[PDB]
């Protein structure tokens, strides 16, 4: 979609860091939908940017940190 | 260009792209090449195309790592690249000392530094050398 | 403190037992022996270094010395970072004519 994410992860010592590129290259900070926080292994997740527009044309960064023990 | 939840590349027909994820969840696609036009370009110094599209990731997990990493000129720096500590680990990566030179102005994690007027030096100009080294308590030296 | 080239010949033997570059170069200074800092670099990596000591008070080792440097450099490619001149062009070594010899 013009919202275009892409992503991959980068572990960056210790941690697990999820890049994460949602370019929303929308038509506007098109509404966004959910997502759900959990315990994970020796890691839980941890990290969400908070808001949920998908900003038209624009593209973002958005970053999960991980809680890698 | 960037697919859309699973997809697989079946094959190519034509420009008007076509796209597969087995069966299902599917494109007709226009274009976008990347590379081709690249390594060509860039083989022949050319970046218009890049620039021109203003195509601008490196990173995506990375994604400078195709060459990019393995640098092929900091022209491509150029194209994009970001903060201080970004440009730094360019101004290494590419070795990009121009980028360096502010890099290290707004460096100051010393080690950082602290082998880099040398490897300035080595690279070139001591008159500058001389002064990164003075901050640097390498008094003696 | 009161000086002496017979303590610094045994010394000399000595720095070369120590096993860290810098003092070792004082002496063959303090010596008065170009030649002995020189060589003394040709172990420790010294390379750039060695370059200006060979410039500033001309073995002329400059010219030999920058060779190996630059090759080093140019093991590590780059026509900048190869870097070339001796006589002329980007030196000019013994037609710039200053002071060293």
């Known amino acids: 979609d013009p919202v275009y994410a892409e992503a991959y992860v980068h572990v960056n010592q210790y941690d697990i860091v999820l890049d994460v590129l949602v370019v929303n290259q929308t038509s506007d900070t098109l509404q966004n939908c959910t997502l759900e926080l959990a315990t994970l292994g020796d890691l839980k997740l941890v990290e969400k940017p908070s808001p949920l527009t998908l900003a038209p044309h624009d593209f973002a960064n958005i970053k999960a940190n991980v809680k890698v023990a | 260009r960037t697919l859309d939840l699973p997809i697989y590349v079946t094959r190519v027909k034509g420009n008007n792209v076509y796209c597969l994820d087995r069966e299902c969840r599917p494109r007709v696609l226009t274009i976008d090449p990347t590379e081709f036009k690249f390594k060509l370009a860039l083989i022949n110094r050319k970046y218009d195309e890049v620039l021109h599209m203003v195509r601008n990731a490196k990173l995506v997990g990375q994604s400078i790592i195709a060459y990019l990493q393995k640098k092929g000129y900091p022209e491509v720096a150029l194209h994009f690249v970001k903060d201080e500590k970004t440009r730094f680990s360019l101004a290494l990566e590419c070795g990009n000392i121009e ?21 300035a030096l080595l690279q070139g100009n001591h008159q500058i050398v001389e002064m990164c080294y003075q901050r640097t308590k390498n008094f003696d030296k | ?95 710039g004519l200053k002071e060293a010899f």
């Open chain 2, 99 to 119: 980028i360096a030179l502010e890099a290290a102005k707004a460096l100051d994690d010393k080690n950082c530094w602290e082998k880099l007027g040398e490897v």
């Open chain 3, 1 to 95: 403190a009161s000086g002496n080239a017979s303590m610094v010949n045994k010394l000399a033997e000595g720095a070369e037992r120590d096993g860290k570059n810098n003092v070792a170069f004082m002496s063959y200074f303090l010596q008065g022996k170009l030649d002995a800092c020189l060589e003394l670099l040709i172990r420790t990596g010294r390379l750039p270094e060695a370059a200006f000591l060979a410039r500033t008070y001309l073995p002329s080792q400059v010219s030999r010395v920058v060779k190996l440097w630059r090759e080093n450099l140019s093991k590590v490619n780059q026509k900048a970072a190869e870097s070339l001149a001796d006589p002329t062009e980007y030196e000019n070594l013994f037609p």
